[PDB]
Structure formats: structure tokens, C-alpha cells
From Swiss-Prot:
Function: Involved in the biogenesis of the 60S ribosomal subunit. May act as a specificity factor that binds precursor rRNAs and tethers the enzymes that carry out the early 5' to 3' exonucleolytic reactions that generate the mature rRNAs.
Subcellular localization, as worded in the UniProt entry: Nucleus, Nucleolus
Similarity comment text for this entry: Belongs to the universal ribosomal protein uL30 family.
Phosphoserine PTM sites in chain numbering: S3
Domain of life according to the entry: Eukaryota
Region (Disordered): 1-41
Additional remarks: Present with 7720 molecules/cell in log phase SD medium.
Bias kind Basic and acidic residues: ranges: 15-34
Official protein name in the record: Ribosome biogenesis protein RLP7
Organism: Saccharomyces cerevisiae (strain ATCC 204508 / S288c) (Baker's yeast)
Length: 43
RNA sequence: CCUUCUCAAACAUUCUGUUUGGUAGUGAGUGAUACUCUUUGGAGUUAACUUGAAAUUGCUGGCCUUUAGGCGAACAAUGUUCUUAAA
């Protein structure tokens, strides 16, 4: 039926949720690093 | 649980020489000979000696600028501030 062969890449699964999770993880890591940095002045 | 001002000129050629400037210390304790000044209260100097980087309380020196600094610096000057020496 007059077709043309090609290669197709399927969409990655759960990319947006992974992106949001990574953004949240980065924010949490920054915040906890700040917490521990200013918590070490009372040693 | 840091690590100490390790040099600059000017003149002259005798593979170098002369001159000038640059150096603020652990504390405590013995100990004379002498000098200068003095507000006569002690202030600055002058041999030498002891020591685990030792230790049991010296009333408060003076002038200037303040809100601790200068006298070794006057329309001059003061650390708790760097944080990958992190966790």
C-alpha cells in the first residue's frame, strides 16, 4: 500500500514525572545542605 | 596546634670598593659600678648571671580621638567577617 520504510523512536515513559522528581530532589538537597551548614556553628 | 620584615638606594671599577637607610624581644628572678633629666613622685640609660616555653594575684602612668585605637602612624587607626582546610 505504497509505504516507505523508516525507523521510529518510541516516546520515553514517565519523563515528565522523573523531571519533576529530579527538580524536587535538587531543591531538597540544596535546602538540607544549607541546614547542615548553618547547624555546624554551635559545635 | 598558626609559623616569624631573608633588603633597598647613591657614587666608583681595585672579578669589587665606600657611604647612607632598614631590626620592638617569653616570662620570672639575682646583681653591681656609673650617667642624664626631674613636676624630687621616678623617667630614660650603663657590667655581668640563673632558668623544662619554668609561673599563686605589683592597684589605677600620662596626653590625644572616640564609641578599644595613636605616642615606632595624627584632620592618623581598631580581627572574631574568607568556609570545598567540607562531611
Amino acid at each position: 500500500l505504497n509505504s516507505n520504510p523508516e525507523i521510529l523512536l518510541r516516546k520515553r515513559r514517565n519523563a515528565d514525572r522523573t523531571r519533576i522528581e529530579r527538580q524536587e530532589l535538587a531543591k531538597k538537597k540544596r535546602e538540607e545542605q544549607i541546614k547542615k551548614k548553618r547547624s555546624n556553628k554551635n559545635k
